[PDB]
Amino acid sequence: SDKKSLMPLVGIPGEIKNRLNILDFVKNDKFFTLYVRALQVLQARDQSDYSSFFQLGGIHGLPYTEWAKAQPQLHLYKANYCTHGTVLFPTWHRAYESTWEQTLWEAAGTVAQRFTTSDQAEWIQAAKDLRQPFWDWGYWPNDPDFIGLPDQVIRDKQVEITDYNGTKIEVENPILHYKFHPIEPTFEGDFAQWQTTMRYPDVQKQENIEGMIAGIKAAAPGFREWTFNMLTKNYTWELFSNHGAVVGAHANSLEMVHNTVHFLIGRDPTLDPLVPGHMGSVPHAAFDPIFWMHHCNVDRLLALWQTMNYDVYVSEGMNREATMGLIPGQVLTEDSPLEPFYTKNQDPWQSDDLEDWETLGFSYPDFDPVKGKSKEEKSVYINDWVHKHYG
Amino acid sequence: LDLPGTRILNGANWANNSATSGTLIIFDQSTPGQDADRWLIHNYLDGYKIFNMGSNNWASVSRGNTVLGVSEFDGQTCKWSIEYSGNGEEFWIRVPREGGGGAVWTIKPASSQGPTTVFLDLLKETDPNQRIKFAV
Numbered sequence: 222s223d224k225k226s227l228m229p230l231v232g233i234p235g236e237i238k239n240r241l242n243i244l245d246f247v248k249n250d251k252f253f254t255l256y257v258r259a260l261q262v263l264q265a266r267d268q269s270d271y272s273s274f275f276q277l278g279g280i281h282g283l284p285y286t287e288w289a290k291a292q293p294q295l296h297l298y299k300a301n302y303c304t305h306g307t308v309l310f311p312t313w314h315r316a317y318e319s320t321w322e323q324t325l326w327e328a329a330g331t332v333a334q335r336f337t338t339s340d341q342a343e344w345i346q347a348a349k350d351l352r353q354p355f356w357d358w359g360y361w362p363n364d365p366d367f368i369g370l371p372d373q374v375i376r377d378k379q380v381e382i383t384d385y386n387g388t389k390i391e392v393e394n395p396i397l398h399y400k401f402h403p404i405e406p407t408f409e410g411d412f413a414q415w416q417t418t419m420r421y422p423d424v425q426k427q428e429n430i431e432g433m434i435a436g437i438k439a440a441a442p443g444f445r446e447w448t449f450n451m452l453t454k455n456y457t458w459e460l461f462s463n464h465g466a467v468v469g470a471h472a473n474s475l476e477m478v479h480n481t482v483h484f485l486i487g488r489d490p491t492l493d494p495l496v497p498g499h500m501g502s503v504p505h506a507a508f509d510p511i512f513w514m515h516h517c518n519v520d521r522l523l524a525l526w527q528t529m530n531y532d533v534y535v536s537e538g539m540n541r542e543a544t545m546g547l548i549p550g551q552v553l554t555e556d557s558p559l560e561p562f563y564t565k566n567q568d569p570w571q572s573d574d575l576e577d578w579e580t581l582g583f584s585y586p587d588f589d590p591v592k593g594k595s596k597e598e599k600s601v602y603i604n605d606w607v608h609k610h611y612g
Numbered sequence: 613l614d615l616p617g618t619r620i621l622n623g624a625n626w627a628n629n630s631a632t633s634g635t636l637i638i639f640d641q642s643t644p645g646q647d648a649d650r651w652l653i654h655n656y657l658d659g660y661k662i663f664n665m666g667s668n669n670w671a672s673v674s675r676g677n678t679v680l681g682v683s684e685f686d687g688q689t690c691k692w693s694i695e696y697s698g699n700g701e702e703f704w705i706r707v708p709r710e711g712g713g714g715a716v717w718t719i720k721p722a723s724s725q726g727p728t729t730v731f732l733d734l735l736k737e738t739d740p741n742q743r744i745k746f747a748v
């Protein structure tokens with residue numbers, strides 16, 4: 222038996238604290254400095270280190286190697302860890318997001334110790350209060366000029382943070398790109414030709430950032446309408462969680478809406494043939510820092526739907542494609558294993574364990590006003606809040 | 613809305629089982645009755661249980677190194693390991709044994725001239741009669 226995982230998924234210990242909207246997050250000078258610094262530390266780490274940006278990103282898809290396992294298997298099934306188009310879609314990505322979050326948290330903690338100013342108590346405290354922010358791609362405030370992503374995430378080549386002696390400094394933006402060191406050998410085709418993660422590539426295999434931004438704005442009303450439907454039109458887990466056996470069967474699901482957001486950053490739809498960026502492709506996606514922001518809002522939208530449809534969770538569904546943890550042609554229930562994620566007791570994480578999201582050490586501003594109230598009270602209030610916000 | 617289950621294949625021949633002890637698990641290309649060829653594989657503890665939608669029988673280790681279908685679930689004989697073979701979409705179904713090394717499913721006739729049922733021998737990584745693929 223012994224240890225199965227060298228890095229168990231434990232979440233964040235101590236007080237429950239919120240994952241904040243990215244727009245307010247960047248305005249917090251302390252949180253933003255810590256995020257960028259922590260991110261700098263993860264990106265610098267050796268790509269063979271299971272607690273590195275590459276390894277954490279490499280869990281999702283490529284490369285097809287085992288992540289933080291004490292003993293290797295005899296015959297490793299080379300495939301994605303992530304489960305896509307199955308009933309286990311929203312739950313697996315909750316585990317995945319927290320696995321990331323605990324590594325970002327543990328890295329930021331050691332950064333806050335480095336500060337040599339007098340306000341270091343406010344730094345040490347900010348380090349525990351730190352969480353991964355989200356991008357609310359459903360909220361359009363009725364403004365064609367609006368973008369749900371600040372300049373520190375999609376434009377700035379250099380971001381301003383605070384150095385350990387109080388001085389303002391400019392550093393390379395670690396949220397913008399991620400530089401491979403080196404490019405993964407199993408990356409084929411175009412992705413074998415990019416030293417950094419690429420967003421919304423043009424015909425000449427280069428980033429079209431302004432074309433990406435125009436496309437987000439123009440679909441922003443259409444996404445308000447689509448997110449609002451997804452939350453208040455789905456009443457079963459089956460129709461909410463997966464996009465369907467034949468992709469494009471469940472138009473209203475979280476996944477299907479979540480799909481079209483990946484392409485907004487990753488893939489220009491007017492190109493023939495398609496030139497996908499990292500975010501535009503499953504086996505490369507989780508290498509782009511924006512992935513963690515998009516999947517923080519996915520987990521948020523799941524939490525909002527959970528509050529409304531309480532005690533409606535994972536329903537049984539088939540597993541058609543073989544992932545690295547899941548047998549092709551098996552049934553998936555709430556008790557099905559979420560590889561490569563293991564509990565502090567060396568058991569595979571299961572949906573059942575992470576139904577209550579606070580067990581992992583986070584919440585969402587939306588849930589502040591209804592703290593302590595009953596499921597029914599939280600149900601009413603949130604369903605009003607979704608109507609006030611995305612209606 | 614009902615789940616379809618899966619087909620347990622060996623090359624092209626699919627697995628089937630009829631009601632009525634412990635009945636044989638026949639591997640051929642003709643289904644005896646309704647849903648006799650569809651299986652439901654849930655995770656069970658640290659392995660898997662296998663259920664036939666047609667006969668409602670569980671794939672069980674039976675006294676005499678054969679794999680038969682049984683009516684009542686029994687955890688000592690109805691749990692299985694499903695390990696990847698190393699090539700294609702082929703798998704070994706394995707008797708969970710202390711630390712590993714347990715006997716694996718083998719698709720060969722009993723005393724020749726068929727029918728080709730399931731048996732239990734030591735794993736031979738090259739033996740095609742042990743390779744199992746699943747299709748929904």
Ligand SMILES: O=c1cccccc1O
Pocket residue numbers: 305480483484500501502503506
């Ligand atoms: O990143 C993705 C890209 C394309 C399609 C589907 C799902 C994804 O998660």
Ligand SMILES: [Cu+2]
Pocket residue numbers: 281303304305314
């Ligand atoms: Cu994914």
Ligand SMILES: [Cu+2]
Pocket residue numbers: 479483516
């Ligand atoms: Cu995604």
Ligand SMILES: [Ho]
Pocket residue numbers: 555556571573574
């Ligand atoms: Ho469970």
